[PDB]
C-alpha cells in the first residue's frame, strides 16, 4: 500500500521532463525549418552572384582588349 | 498489486520517452547552434558576393563608356 504511493511520486517527474523537452524540441524544429529555408535561399543568391561576377569579368576582359 | 504494476509500468514508459526526448532535444539544440552559425557565415559571404558583383556593374559600365 505504501509502495503504491511512492511509485506515483516518480511518475509525475518523468512526465513533466518529457513535456518540457517536447515543448522546446518543437520550437527548435520550427526554428530550424525557418533557418534552413533562408540557408538555401542565401545559397541560391550566392550561386547567382558568383555567376554574375564570372560573366562580368569575362566581358570586362573583352572590353579591355577592344580598348587597347 | 496489479495497480502497482500498472503505475510502475507507466514509470518505465514515462522515463523511456523522457530520456529519449531530452537526448534528441539536446542533440537538436546543439545542431541548431551549428546551423545558425552556418547561416550567419553563408549570409556574410553572400553579402560580400553581392557587393562585389555590384562593383563590377559600375565598373563594366564606366569601361563601356571609355570604349565608346
Amino acid at each position: 500500500a505504501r509502495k503504491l504511493v511512492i511509485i506515483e511520486s516518480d511518475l509525475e517527474r518523468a512526465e513533466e521532463r518529457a513535456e518540457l523537452s517536447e515543448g522546446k524540441c518543437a520550437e527548435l524544429e520550427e526554428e530550424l525549418k525557418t533557418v534552413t529555408n533562408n540557408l538555401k535561399s542565401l545559397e541560391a543568391q550566392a550561386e547567382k552572384y558568383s555567376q554574375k561576377e564570372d560573366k562580368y569579368e569575362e566581358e570586362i576582359k573583352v572590353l579591355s582588349d577592344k580598348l587597347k | 498489486a496489479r495497480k502497482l504494476v500498472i503505475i510502475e509500468s507507466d514509470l518505465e514508459r514515462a522515463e523511456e520517452r523522457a530520456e529519449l526526448s531530452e537526448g534528441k532535444c539536446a542533440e537538436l539544440e546543439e545542431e541548431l547552434k551549428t546551423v545558425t552559425n552556418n547561416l550567419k557565415s553563408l549570409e556574410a559571404q553572400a553579402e560580400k558576393y553581392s557587393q562585389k558583383e555590384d562593383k563590377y556593374e559600375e565598373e563594366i559600365k564606366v569601361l563601356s563608356d571609355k570604349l565608346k
Binding site: 538555401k40 550561386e47 547567382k48 555567376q51 560573366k55 | -
Partner: protein, 375 residues
C-alpha cells in the same frame, strides 16, 4: 460577386489542375490529377470503394491507391473518370454552379479535333453551359506586361511549346511541340536511380520523386567541370532523410537528370537542346525580325524554377547565333501562374464576345463550331 453572371477561371493540364473562384488573380484550389483503384478490395464494405481516390484525399493517402493515369499527351484512356473529377471542383470547394456562370479552359496546341468536341459535349449537353471558351496556353501568358513584340516558351507537365507569339500567330512552322515536360522528368529519374540500386518501382512512390525533386535538385551548369567536383563531399552530398526512414544522398543525381533537357539524345530522339529549337523558330521568320526577338524572350512555366535554368541559356544562345544585338530573356519570377494571370483577363474581356461560343452557335455549325471558325 453577385450582379452579372460572373465567370470562373480555370487551367487544366496533364498533371496539375489550376482553378479558383471568379474574378480572382491566382488559383485558389490546385488539386493534383490522380485517380486510381484499390487493387487490394477497399475493406469493400468500409466504403463501396469506387472513388479511385482524388484531390487532397488521394494525395494524402497514396499507399493503397493504384494511381491510374487517364490523360497521357493527347489520348485519354478513359473519359468516364474525368466526369467525376470536374464534379468535385466547382462544388466541393467553389460552392458555385456551372449552370449559372460561364467557363474558361486552356487549349493544348495540336490536340485531336475529336477531343475539343467531346469536352464541350459534357458541358452543353449535361452541365448546360450557354457560354464558354478554350484559349491557347502561351498566348495568355503574353497579354500581361507592356509590349506587343516578345517570344514565349510555355510548358509545365504536358508538352513543351516554343511559340514565338509577339506581333501575330501562325505562319510557316516556327512553333514547336515536344513531349518532354514535367511527367517526363518524373519518369526519367527512377530509371537512372537504378544504377545506384535505388529503384522506386510502383507509381505511388513515383510521385514522391517529383515531390523531393522540387526542393533541392538543380541543373548542371557544365557537367564536365561538375564531374571533377564530385571528388569533394560538400556541394554534392545533399541531405534529405526520407519521411519514411532512409537518407538518400542526392549528390550527382541532382544535376544528372536535368542534363537530358539539353541532351534529348538520352531519351531516344533527334531533337536538339532547347537552344537549338530557339534557332529553329528564329531562322524561319523574316530577317529584320531577329534583333528584337533576342531583346525579349518570355519563359513561362514553373518547370523553369530549377536552379541553373536561365544562366545556361545565355551561354548556348550567344554561341551559334548573331551576336550584335541585346540578348535578353524574360523569365518571369513566378512564371507558373502567368497563364492564370492572362486567364482572368479573357474571362473579363468584352471583345471576348467576338471569340467565345454561345449555346445556339454550337448547334448551328455543329460540334466543329469551335476550331472550325477560330484558331
Amino acid at each position: 460577386d453577385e450582379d452579372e453572371t460572373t465567370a470562373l477561371v480555370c487551367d487544366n493540364g496533364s498533371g496539375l489542375v489550376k482553378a479558383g473562384f471568379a474574378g480572382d488573380d491566382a488559383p485558389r484550389a490546385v488539386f493534383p490529377s490522380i485517380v486510381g483503384r484499390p487493387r487490394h478490395q477497399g475493406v469493400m464494405v468500409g466504403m463501396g470503394q469506387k472513388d479511385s481516390y482524388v484531390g487532397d484525399e488521394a494525395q494524402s493517402k497514396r499507399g493503397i491507391l493504384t494511381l491510374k493515369y487517364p490523360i497521357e499527351h493527347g489520348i485519354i484512356t478513359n473519359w468516364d473518370d474525368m466526369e467525376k473529377i470536374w464534379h468535385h471542383t466547382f462544388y466541393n470547394e467553389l460552392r458555385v454552379a456551372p449552370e449559372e456562370h460561364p467557363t474558361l479552359l486552356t487549349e493544348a496546341p495540336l490536340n485531336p479535333k475529336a477531343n475539343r468536341e467531346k469536352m464541350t459535349q459534357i458541358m452543353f449537353e449535361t452541365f448546360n453551359v450557354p457560354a464558354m471558351y478554350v484559349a491557347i496556353q502561351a498566348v495568355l501568358s503574353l497579354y500581361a506586361s507592356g509590349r506587343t513584340t516578345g517570344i514565349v516558351l510555355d510548358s509545365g507537365d504536358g508538352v513543351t511549346h516554343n511559340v514565338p507569339i509577339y506581333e501575330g500567330y501562325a505562319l510557316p512552322h516556327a512553333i514547336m511541340r515536344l513531349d518532354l515536360a514535367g511527367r517526363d522528368l518524373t519518369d526519367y529519374l527512377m530509371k537512372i536511380l537504378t544504377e545506384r540500386g535505388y529503384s522506386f518501382v510502383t507509381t505511388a512512390e513515383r510521385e514522391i520523386v517529383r515531390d523531393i525533386k522540387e526542393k533541392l535538385c538543380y541543373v548542371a551548369l557544365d557537367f564536365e567541370n561538375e564531374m571533377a567536383t564530385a571528388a569533394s563531399s560538400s556541394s554534392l552530398e545533399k541531405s534529405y532523410e526520407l519521411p519514411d526512414g532512409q537518407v538518400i544522398t542526392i549528390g550527382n543525381e541532382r544535376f544528372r537528370c536535368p542534363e537530358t533537357l539539353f541532351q534529348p539524345s538520352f531519351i531516344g530522339m533527334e531533337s536538339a537542346g532547347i537552344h537549338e529549337t530557339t534557332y529553329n523558330s528564329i531562322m524561319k521568320c523574316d530577317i529584320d525580325i531577329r534583333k528584337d526577338l533576342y531583346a525579349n524572350n518570355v519563359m513561362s512555366g514553373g518547370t523553369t524554377m530549377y536552379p541553373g535554368i536561365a544562366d545556361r541559356m545565355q551561354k548556348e544562345i550567344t554561341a551559334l547565333a548573331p551576336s550584335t544585338m541585346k540578348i535578353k530573356i524574360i523569365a518571369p519570377p513566378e512564371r507558373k501562374y502567368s497563364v492564370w494571370i492572362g486567364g482572368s483577363i479573357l474571362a473579363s474581356l468584352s471583345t471576348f464576345q467576338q471569340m467565345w461560343i454561345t449555346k445556339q452557335e454550337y448547334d448551328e455549325a455543329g460540334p466543329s463550331i469551335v476550331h472550325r471558325k477560330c484558331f
